[PDB]
Design a protein around this ligand. Structure first.
Ligand SMILES: Nc1nc2c(ncn2[C@@H]2O[C@H](COP(=O)(O)OP(=O)(O)OP(=O)(O)O)[C@@H](O)[C@H]2O)c(=O)[nH]1
Ligand SMILES: Nc1nc2c(ncn2[C@@H]2O[C@H](COP(=O)(O)OP(=O)(O)OP(=O)(O)O)[C@@H](O)[C@H]2O)c(=O)[nH]1
Ligand SMILES: Nc1nc2c(ncn2[C@@H]2O[C@H](COP(=O)(O)OP(=O)(O)O)[C@@H](O)[C@H]2O)c(=O)[nH]1
Ligand SMILES: Nc1nc2c(ncn2[C@@H]2O[C@H](COP(=O)(O)OP(=O)(O)O)[C@@H](O)[C@H]2O)c(=O)[nH]1
Ligand SMILES: [Mg+2]
Ligand SMILES: [Mg+2]
Lengths: 428, 426, 426, 428
């Protein structure tokens, strides 16, 4: 019943920092590993120290060093903290090939070591970003190997969705297009969120006009914990990760369920307001709490999964579902009946001490696969196209051995993906 | 004379958690395993569900099956999880994930061999089995998937024993798995012809009853599964305890099945009303019959007056006159003659037990076989077709080797049950 | 009437350490040597295994043999190492090193003369020997190598006494010595025709039982050898103590050997389950027979239902009815008739003792002679051949003078036992 | 039940220093010999002083003087400390012949004296190095005599394997080739380790980038103690030295089992990590812990012996074996079934105070005979060849009476040895 977390790149690792901090908060784990009390994620020592079963990869020492100098440096095993010396430079060509390919063997052997520590490997999940060099480059490299060795294990990916308006990486389209090509075909499911959309959540629901990544990742951590800690904890409907895959992936392509999370409420907003299960789920179908800037009303739904924490009575859930099925404007694709996965954990929602979110007594996470995602690809299509037509920055990949045909090909694979969304949109 | 029960799937395991609790209540058996009752009858027929182990320990004759230790553990952690022996916990590791193919066709299939071995060990421990009962969900992976596989093998080993099962039927509003109708379709395809009878439980209907007549605003599944266990326990106790009428499960099966393929049941239960009104209720046979006939007191989301009634069983617990029961059943038949099928004269049959359920003076269990049942099949079949055309999640299933033509035949078979209900609906 | 036991090899010495412990438990004999029991029977038949020395000291009639003082010392250092007299510790200096050639053929051969002299001294100390028993490993140097040599000489001196031995058979997974199959092959070559019977113990199977039914996660060899001693002690106590049936070792041997060469046994034991379930177990004769028949409760890594059963002995300890035992054995014969050999009518034989093992109400020892045994021989023979062709470590053996043609004949002889099992497998 | 250690050359003696220090650590032996408490190695005096039954040979006073001035100078008997005045000069021709042959008679008589002190000589073992003058020269000289007098006793040799990359001895190939010729034929078994490989172990498992020989020999000492102290101590499966020979040497040639040792873990690496028997043995089949730079995956296995310390339950061992037999890529030679010797001592693993290795509760030593060793010989073949073709440095041997034919011959003997490995590799 075990799983592995993999943190690649800054985004992967810094999100991971929040994630493991939250898992410590879930059980009262001390920075040194001492836990007085979740062995699905952790491995126990004779001292009662538990080791989070995870791998941290950075090709630049700095971020891992940040871990190594922080409080959780005692928690993590030195072998889990893997670092190279040089970067990918925002570039798949080095991340996947030239540079990252050198260290990956080590990385894999640490993974395999942990796989041998697992007794019942259920699977794993990889945290990264769609635009970066290691964030997406190295990441797909890893998938290429992990899908061989662990072909039957859960291969869930979580990635930051490139913001349409702000991006620090000029060749991000190129990176992301190459990842599509290689991740679609290897991964089982990839989830993503938009930091821009999140900013809007922070300013509207948390009332914060100063979000940093350390805020943004707390919110992400919430979502992740709902599906990682609480799915291993007790509930009414205990849903596994393999079950998630088995209930969220409808086609052999990928699919890309997007996250939505409600409650996201400031402490003051929690006052004077009573949420019910149904009210929280109402919020879950509002564009306003959509974690990716993509309009839910534009597309049609294919999948939807609702996962519940704390004070949730199935009775209320059932009523809530009835209304979301019938009251809303949620259009859905023919193919699908509304079999929405309901996970119901008794495990209460948790809050980070010193965080922004209010203590809540119940909480709902929503995953959804909508046809509007093709528009996200359309965004990438043109951004890629523009650059590629001019061949701007192309020498930074070509010099590492990339082929122009390959890039065209990858775009075409994306186009095919868009076409399949088109297909799904056609009802039948 | 004895029965073996097997629970499977998270649903089945949690239902059984309440079922066994009740059975031990009925007999005064402590959560730790020993007998601390106080009635002769409490031990007298205990054999049907318990083995007395050395030390005056009673072992529930049941197997708990799952593919995730954690659910099993949670069961074990409560009272009455200690009464089960470790040997009755048969489980694997890695879920099923609510996947029929995994459950039945592939992975869960692997576990079934160990389950069956224990089944065999228990079949030997019994003197003479009357039958077997299984608890599960129709749209679940281990509940239906693995469970079905097991049933086909048990039936094979014991053609001469009763094979029945109670199962949670996907409610119109709350499906959890997107392909829940697919799993259900496949289970019909396998179960119907590999079972003597199956009961149809709808959670939605149950949630309506709990608020509608019981006026409760906090139930959980444990409270609703209490109601489920009331009907299950109602059936077997009579068989166990002294009564007036004819207290044999097989005879029940004989009286309720007019045709080899149409064996689906609508359970209902009386009395079943809130405490407020309990000060304004009278306890008579007509009172129970009013609650029994009323469709709102059915646990299945069907409407018996929409369809036609093929067979009705009225089981009574506690001291009642024979006359009164006879007359009221007749009256029911008379007044609701428009719903009964004309081919069966006196279509309402009774069974009477003189032991009341603990805490009540009287009670009654409604078991029906109407044509209305077909409506559930119709809903599923339709939903199925849509999914079938799109292959939603079928890559998971076909990825594990499930072939679409098998599913095609499953669809037909669903439609066949509907057509046969039409054939006897007239 | 008396028995002499000789232990050899590190295995044999450690097994015997538990065996004798148990025997003294059975009779209330203190680790220091005196009798402090409390039952008449405890002293009454003590003669079979103990000499009472002046002062009411009991001397175990056994010889401890090794070629390294340190193992002997460790035995001596514990309780019950003090009950053995110094004269029963016969050992040399410099190992054997798990080398048959050294053990049997050369160096260990030298020690055997001193061992035998002590054997003779004890044979005189007895009034009338029933037989001898030896404990050893089949793939070990002193266990099998030297031990075998000793056996050939004892048999020579006493053709009319029972010669049996219990031996650890190389488990498929854990061999220690690279040529462990070689040593085993050579021991078959020598032992089979120089013994009346031999028992086949597989440590792997034992480790499965200890976790499988006993649910234990810490055993050591002392815990597994406890199980071994349970079977050994089970056999001889009946012979010692009052019973109902026929309590003579030779008679056991007669009933279990249909053919001069096929005398290999599969020991098993009941009851043998974890404490948790002990609150859910019932103690009946069928209960013991269920545990006895079940292959998983065998201590040999064989599968009796794969082969055919030639002979079965069921030994019972404690008060049981004759009827029940007779009927259940018959039932076994009936239901498992497909495994029994048709040439022997009523192939299941019984023996009954009225004394239960300390702490239990009842117990049973399973002894079988199936054809399934041949599978172990086949595994060894095959492995042997490969090594034979390469002469792995045979320079050590040929260096000590062991000739390859002798080994060739040994190989044949293994194959002969297999063919004879086939000849009676039919 | 007694044995003799022989320390020839610096390498032999300095390793010995660590070894006897460890034996003192095993029982609490004071530098003066006072032991308050292993007489298989030691000889007792009426003062309760025990003398380690060993001979120290150096033809240059200095190293023995180092012993004579250290703390253990009180431990060793002055007659055990044998020294000449002049060296072999890296040269077999002087080590075996011209110089060492003069003192050897003394040396032998001290050995014989100790042999007479032994009551049950089980055997002995010789510590040296394959490249040096006394390290290999004198060493083989000794074997020539010891194999006569003690023909039936254990003749185990331990030698440093010449590092392929760093060697301080230009005629080391020549020395080692001559030793092959003379040791193969006389010795029973020779074990060897590569200081370069060890450095990699120190830097990867101990995390030390500054290993000196005094570190390197501690690690060697660990391995040796597992087979020397703990094999005389109590266990489940008490394995003797003669048993080792009887379980490790498959052919009358030599054979050369290589050492592997796992656990080799820094204190910090021990934290947060729980080793089992099985996990330690997993590490034992990893190239990464291979004490000789030779790839385990290249060759095929012929022999393998696993020796256990501390908290080892045979139950777990059995399971571990099952997986190494079936899970691994360990190819093995036909000839051999997998009868791997399992020695199981209850005696716990010991750690040197102030050392680098972490306190462990259980430990496993692995000996293995792989066909990849022929590549090691191939290395020597060419190194020898190059020198010999040019006849570089040849006058340093010729002037001492060496013959060129002899050198050719010795190479040919090595070639024959390689051919026999070839033979074994051919499965049959
Ligand atoms: N939510 C979130 N997004 C982040 C975080 N850090 C970076 N990102 C986003 O991820 C992308 C940045 O990737 P980089 O940090 O440039 O690169 P990398 O993927 O770590 O790998 P390299 O390019 O080789 O350094 C941008 O789109 C950022 O907006 C973080 O902590 N949280
Ligand atoms: N592990 C280990 N290797 C050593 C040690 N000392 C030397 N060596 C190695 O052994 C070889 C050195 O042998 P030398 O010290 O030159 O010579 P010797 O064998 O003592 O004999 P002479 O040549 O006559 O001085 C080199 O390959 C060294 O790397 C030591 O303390 N430990
Ligand atoms: N009455 C009832 N239904 C349940 C319970 N648990 C799950 N269910 C129903 O079972 C279906 C889900 O299948 P599930 O039991 O999770 O499948 P499995 O666990 O993979 O075999 C849904 O329709 C739920 O309403 C329960 O404890 N009581
Ligand atoms: N059951 C059991 N087997 C043992 C014991 N000791 C060694 N063995 C087995 O004996 C074989 C090894 O032979 P060994 O007894 O060392 O030979 P010897 O000591 O040279 O005669 C292996 O198959 C071990 O599993 C023990 O105490 N109990
Ligand atoms: Mg970076
Ligand atoms: Mg020197």
């Amino acid at each position: 019943r075990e799983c592995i977390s993999i943190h690649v790149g800054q985004a992967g690792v810094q999100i991971g920092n929040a994630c493991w901090e939250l898992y410590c908060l879930e059980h009262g784990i001390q920075p040194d590993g001492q836990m007085p009390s979740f062995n699905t994620f952790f491995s126990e020592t004779g001292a009662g120290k538990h080791v989070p079963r995870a791998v941290f990869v950075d090709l630049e020492p700095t971020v891992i060093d940040e871990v190594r100098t922080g409080t959780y440096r005692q928690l993590f095993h030195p072998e889990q903290l893997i670092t190279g010396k040089e970067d990918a430079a925002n570039n798949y060509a080095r991340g996947h090939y030239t540079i990252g390919k050198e260290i990956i063997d080590l990385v894999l052997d640490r993974i395999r070591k942990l796989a041998d520590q697992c007794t019942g490997l259920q699977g794993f999940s990889v945290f990264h970003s769609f635009g970066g060099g290691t964030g997406s480059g190295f990441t797909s490299l890893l998938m290429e190997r992990l899908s061989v060795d662990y072909g039957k294990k859960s291969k869930l990916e979580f990635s930051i969705y490139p913001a349409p308006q702000v991006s620090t990486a000029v060749v991000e389209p190129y990176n992301s297009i190459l990842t599509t090509h290689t991740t679609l075909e290897h991964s089982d499911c990839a989830f993503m969120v938009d930091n821009e959309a999140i900013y809007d959540i922070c300013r509207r629901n948390l009332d914060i006009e100063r979000p940093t990544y350390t805020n943004l990742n707390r919110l992400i951590g919430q979502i992740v914990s709902s599906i990682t800690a609480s799915l291993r904890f007790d509930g009414a409907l205990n849903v596994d990760l393999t079950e998630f895959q088995t209930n969220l992936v409808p086609y052999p392509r990928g699919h890309f369920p997007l996250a939505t999370y409600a409650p996201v409420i400031s402490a003051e907003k929690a006052y004077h307001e009573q949420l019910s299960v149904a009210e929280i789920t109402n919020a879950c179908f509002e564009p306003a709490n959509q974690m990716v800037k993509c309009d839910p009303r534009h597309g049609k739904y294919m999948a939807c999964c609702l996962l519940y924490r704390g004070d949730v009575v199935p009775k209320d859930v059932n009523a809530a579902i009835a209304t979301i099925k019938t009251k809303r404007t949620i259009q859905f694709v023919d193919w699908c009946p509304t079999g929405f996965k309901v996970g119901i954990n008794y495990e209460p929602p948790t809050v980070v001490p010193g965080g922004d979110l209010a203590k809540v007594q119940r909480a709902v996470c929503m995953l959804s696969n909508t046809t509007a995602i093709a528009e996200a690809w359309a965004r990438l299509d043109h951004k890629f196209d523009l650059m590629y037509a001019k061949r701007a920055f192309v020498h930074w990949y070509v010099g590492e051995g990339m082929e122009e045909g390959e890039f065209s090909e990858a775009r075409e694979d994306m186009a095919a993906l868009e076409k399949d969304y088109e297909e799904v949109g056609v009802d039948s | 004379r004895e029965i073996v029960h097997i629970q499977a799937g998270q649903c089945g395991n949690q239902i059984g958690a309440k079922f066994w609790e009740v059975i031990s209540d009925e007999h005064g058996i402590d959560p730790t395993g020993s007998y601390h009752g106080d009635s002769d009858l409490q031990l007298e027929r205990i054999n049907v569900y318990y083995n007395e182990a050395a030390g005056n320990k009673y072992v529930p004759r049941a197997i708990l099956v799952d593919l995730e230790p954690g659910t099993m553990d949670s069961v074990r952690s409560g009272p009455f999880g200690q009464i089960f022996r470790p040997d009755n916990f048969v489980f694997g590791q890695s879920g099923a994930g609510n996947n029929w193919a995994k459950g039945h066709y592939t992975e869960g299939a692997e576990l079934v061999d160990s389950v069956l071995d224990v089944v065999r060990k228990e079949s030997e421990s019994c003197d003479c089995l009357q039958g077997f009962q299984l608890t599960h969900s129709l749209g679940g992976g281990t509940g239906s998937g693995m469970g079905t596989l097991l049933i086909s093998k048990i039936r094979e080993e014991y053609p001469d024993r009763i094979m029945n099962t109670f199962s949670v039927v996907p409610s119109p509003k709350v499906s959890d798995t997107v392909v829940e109708p697919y799993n259900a379709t496949l289970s019909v395809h396998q179960l119907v012809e590999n079972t003597d009878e199956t009961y149809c439980i709808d959670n939605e209907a149950l949630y309506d009853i709990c608020f509608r007549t019981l006026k409760l605003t906090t139930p959980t599944y444990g409270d609703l599964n209490h109601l489920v266990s009331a009907t299950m326990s109602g059936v077997t106790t009579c068989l166990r305890f002294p009564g007036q009428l004819n207290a044999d499960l097989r005879k029940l099966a004989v009286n309720m099945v007019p045709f080899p393929r149409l064996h689906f049941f609508m359970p209902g239960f009386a009395p079943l009303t809130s405490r407020g009104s309990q000060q304004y209720r009278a306890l008579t046979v007509p009172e129970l019959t009013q609650q029994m006939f009323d469709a709102k007191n059915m646990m299945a989301a069907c409407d018996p007056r929409h369809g036609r009634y093929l067979t009705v069983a009225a089981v009574f617990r506690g001291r009642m006159s024979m006359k009164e029961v006879d007359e009221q059943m007749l009256n029911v038949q008379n007044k609701n003659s428009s719903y009964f099928v004309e081919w069966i004269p006196n279509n309402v049959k009774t069974a009477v037990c003189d032991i009341p359920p603990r805490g009540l003076k009287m009670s009654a269990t409604f078991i029906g076989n109407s044509t209305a049942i077909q409506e559930l099949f119709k809903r599923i079949s339709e939903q199925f077709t849509a999914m079938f055309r799109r292959k939603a999640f079928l890559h998971w299933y076909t990825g594990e080797g499930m072939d679409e033509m098998e599913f095609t035949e499953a669809e037909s078979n669903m439609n066949d049950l509907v057509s046969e209900y039409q054939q006897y609906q007239d």
